[PDB]
Amino acid sequence: TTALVCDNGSGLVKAGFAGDDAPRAVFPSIVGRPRHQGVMVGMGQKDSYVGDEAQSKRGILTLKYPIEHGIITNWDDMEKIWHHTFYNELRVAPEEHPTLLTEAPLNPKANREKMTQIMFETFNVPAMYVAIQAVLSLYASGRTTGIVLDSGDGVTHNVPIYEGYALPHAIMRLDLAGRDLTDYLMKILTERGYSFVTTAEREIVRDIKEKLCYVALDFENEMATAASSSSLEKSYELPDGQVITIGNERFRCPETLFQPSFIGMESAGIHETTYNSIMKCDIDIRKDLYANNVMSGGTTMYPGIADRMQKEITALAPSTMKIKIIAPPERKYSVWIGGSILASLSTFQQMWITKQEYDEAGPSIVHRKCF
Amino acid sequence: TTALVCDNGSGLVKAGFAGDDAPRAVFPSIVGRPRHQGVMVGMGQKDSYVGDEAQSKRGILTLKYPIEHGIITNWDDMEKIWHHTFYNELRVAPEEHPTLLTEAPLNPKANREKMTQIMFETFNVPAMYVAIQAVLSLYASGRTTGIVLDSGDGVTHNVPIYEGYALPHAIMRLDLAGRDLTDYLMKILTERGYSFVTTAEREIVRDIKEKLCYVALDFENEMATAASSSSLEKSYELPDGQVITIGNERFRCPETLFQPSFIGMESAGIHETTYNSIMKCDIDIRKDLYANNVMSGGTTMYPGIADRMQKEITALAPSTMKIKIIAPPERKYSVWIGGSILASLSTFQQMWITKQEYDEAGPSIVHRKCF
Amino acid sequence: TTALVCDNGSGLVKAGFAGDDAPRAVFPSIVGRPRHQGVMVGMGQKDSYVGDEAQSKRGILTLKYPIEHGIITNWDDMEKIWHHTFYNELRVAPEEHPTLLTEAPLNPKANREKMTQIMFETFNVPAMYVAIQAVLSLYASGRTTGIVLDSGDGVTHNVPIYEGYALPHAIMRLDLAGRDLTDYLMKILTERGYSFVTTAEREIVRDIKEKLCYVALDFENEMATAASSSSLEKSYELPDGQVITIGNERFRCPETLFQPSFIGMESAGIHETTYNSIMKCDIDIRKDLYANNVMSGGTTMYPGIADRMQKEITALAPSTMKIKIIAPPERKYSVWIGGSILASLSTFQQMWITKQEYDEAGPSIVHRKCF
Ligand SMILES: Nc1ncnc2c1ncn2[C@@H]1O[C@H](COP(=O)(O)OP(=O)(O)O)[C@@H](O)[C@H]1O
Ligand SMILES: Nc1ncnc2c1ncn2[C@@H]1O[C@H](COP(=O)(O)OP(=O)(O)O)[C@@H](O)[C@H]1O
Ligand SMILES: Nc1ncnc2c1ncn2[C@@H]1O[C@H](COP(=O)(O)OP(=O)(O)O)[C@@H](O)[C@H]1O
Ligand SMILES: [Mg+2]
Ligand SMILES: [Mg+2]
Ligand SMILES: [Mg+2]
Prior knowledge:
Chains A, B, C: It comes from Gallus gallus. Chains A, B, C: It holds the Pfam family Actin. Chains A, B, C: InterPro entries: Actin, Actin/actin-like_CS, Actin_CS, ATPase_NBD. The structure is cut from a larger assembly and holds 3 copies of chain A. Chain A is of the alpha+beta class. Chain A has helices at about 50-55, 75-90, 110-120, 135-140, 180-190, 200-210, 220-230, 250, 270-280, 285-290, 305-315, 335-345, 355-360, 365-370; strands spanning about 5-10, 10-15, 25-30, 30-35, 35-40, 50, 60-65, 65-70, 70, 100-105, 125-130, 145-150, 155-160, 165, 170-175, 235, 245, 295, 325, 355. In chain A, strands 3-2-1-10-11-20 form a 6-stranded mixed sheet, sandwiched between helices. In chain A, strands 12, 13, 14, 15, 18 and 19 form a 6-stranded mixed sheet that branches. In chain A, strand 13 (about 155-160) and strand 14 (about 165) form a beta hairpin. In chain A, helix 4 (about 135-140) crosses helix 12 (about 335-345) and helix 5 (about 180-190) packs across helix 6. The longest helix of chain A has 16 residues, at about 75-90. The radius of gyration of chain A is 22 Å and the shape is flat. Chains in contact: A-B, A-C, B-C. The structure holds adenosine-5'-diphosphate (3 copies) and magnesium ion (MG) (3 copies). One adenosine-5'-diphosphate binds near residues 11, 178 and 209 of chain C.
């Protein structure tokens, strides 16, 4: 029987069948509930919406995100999201298909414990497994040696690997991701006058961010140019016909990745965090990691991010090293593609957690049979 | 058992049976009482007249309107109007049928409280309901989205809806309707020497307004054209053969709707009222409201009103948006037609106030079980 | 020479000389123009009126506010109000006096750029300064730490400060203030048959809101009390001598501050705004901020507000922390009082923007020198 690969991200769900080369369904991880009153008898139905139907009717709803900062926080909505996925997106009964789930490293253990408990008790899957996202990202790239950098919607973590042996003491995780940039951009758009506060208009600001934002290769030069010239300005149209114009906000918004002090956080930028993660590895394997930086996740889709990372790491590492940034165009779905590859492998079939194993050992097993 | 439908206008009473295609009885809401010395013996009986028999005899009667600005001001007359309807026009037994009334938004609570009290205690109606006018108008159009401009004889309210969920913070209401236009017409006609002062001549002026008055597409152009040429002058005959002729008055009377200052008011015309109602709704749904701009009520039957409203709203709103004014030819009875459709619904049967429920809770129950 | 402190509020202008303990001039921030026929010859002069003399004649005027939500929208009238202030209320030529201003946080930049331009070029002040209102409100209390809650007529905004250092990522701003409450009062007074559709009647409703309104310590209990008895009702005499009577509208209106879902806003009440602004801070300073809460602004004069906010934050925050609401008796002017404090300090004299620096740099200097 064909297994199911389900990557519940903080921003998007990527679910489908093992063996494909792309997710079958991709819909935002939100659940909406009406806030106005219904008056037209026989209409105004379905007090909750999930995914794209909720997105379309967002004009009258408060949109709730179940997964925050990569730690699940609202289990009812998440069971609802899983049910919608299986029964309306994939349209396949979950109880007949082995399942593969993903989680970020350094995550609360109760997270995966209850994640296993739900999948076994409610959906009755024959077996299941949980795999660190960065391992899957490295599988998608066919490499056995790389320092994965995955930057999703709420989290951003590095995982240094060498010939298949991970280095769990060299793992860094950073709570700075796309939603933080969305909020900061919503905060700096009021600096021109365009005020967005709602849960709906946060989606407009996110769409603006996707549409226009880019990373400056030398921040001060772009700041000076924008302050002294108008070739960088750009205009975007809201759903009600208004047209907003944004100037240097385009490259100020993504810059939080490299200077988290824009939002007040203390941590060092992504570049310095990756270099530090490399420096924690044995002397004999810093060379290989310096040349196998594998990116992933949505937030790493900004133009100029790859060149900026290459520059900002080569500035730190010794001159004689060869920094190489690898960023395939498909990196928005790299974790899921790796998950598909991993679930397909014949030698992997001996590693699932089965229903009877769960019956004997309960959720606690998921830590022993999954790193 | 079939339920009556009674739409109590400020100027006309529309009554009928639920499910039918049009009202059964339509007559003005006036009560006349003779103002002259009776001389003949066994003649001129029946002290007070109502409706059509009041209009016919209006030579010797003092015509009074029980309602004013959509507020029932004389219950001792409105009870007579209801009795006339039930026991002379429809000729039904009120105890055998539910009754679905109507009332504009923002009316005083005591209005519907006392309305329900009268319906339940005087007529013994087994069940009843008081549905806002704009929702009925929107049923009558077979839609679930739109912004209704229902301009009756007392009130011109403006209710926006979206997918069955009304937006009560954006319901504008402007007290300027057909009666005020009749008053302004009656005043301006003194310019030419025709002095109408008695309450029957107010009916004559209402007839002139209905027959002739029309809304200019460009007010200043029509003013200049009428001033410089007599092409627009038209003649009307009083019931005594006196031939009056009114020129620019024909559009100076309706024009007040768009320039309320003509009668001393400040508030902006109906175009601005509708636009401001739109601009207070969520940003997502504005595009859909711009294209479902229903109208209703008697006063909107003026020729050239729809074109003028299209012109003005298109002028105000952003260009990229598409405005659409919708005006069905039977919009003089849209509220009643929607009431019929509503009363004919399947699920609507649970939402009647029942005589038992009113007896247990009291007139406050209309604020709970009705919009 | 003595410097002027000129706090241009959304609903009042507070002005005077720095150092004094109270404003020299306090008059409403409105401009009025006639709207009737000026029949008499040699009378009906002064085409427009400002402030108190504009209220005096409001019966024949249309009143307009230059500022809408702490944003200047009508420059040709704000300049007019400033001229009125300088040359009629303080009666001093400004070209010899430095000026201190105020603004809300997270506000459009063009606002202050243009304000600096007007002040320098039209009035010729030697120097001027613009300071966020919460900083000044914290000077008013002599506090170097705390979380200011400034709720003016236009806007509400929290600003946390710790031992002199601001946390501009944790600043929050909410556009819900006295005027929204006044309009909601105008709306809910219709239920009782009173109608206030005029701007002059908006001034009357503002006076009613000032007088009869308070905050409910437990909203449901107050609803039960009002429904179950007529204890709360109070009467107010209109200028015409008509007397109105209002029941639970006394606290339904100031309740919107804690439930913006009354007026269609989905946002969180001021208590949740404050709690979230605190939790955005670092862990070591939350304990200090919980016990250093400060209010300001006119809108916080509703009786019982401090106790209700005490209750709400104590409901949200951990039980071991101490919640304490500092509500100075003079909080209506806290901002102006803080300005009087600030402008006197010698150490501050080096922060003025002089005419010379403006000439060298242009209006953009106000973003680099001012907070
Ligand atoms: N082309 C893009 N440019 C910038 N940001 C993007 C782009 N596409 C997506 N994003 C951002 O990335 C986030 C989603 O990325 P994603 O990989 O799906 O995270 P996750 O799966 O964990 O939820 C979104 O919040 C979005 O703002
Ligand atoms: N053809 C018309 N042109 C202009 N006004 C009209 C026309 N027919 C009716 N009216 C006006 O519409 C008003 C009655 O319409 P109606 O919608 O039924 O008011 P109500 O809300 O009380 O029911 C009257 O004031 C009448 O003058
Ligand atoms: N004693 C009061 N009780 C209730 N509301 C008040 C009181 N004094 C003023 N207000 C309201 O607060 C607003 C004025 O407060 P204010 O602080 O001066 O605003 P601004 O920022 O413009 O200076 C007015 O809208 C008024 O309705
Ligand atoms: Mg991811
Ligand atoms: Mg009507
Ligand atoms: Mg103020």
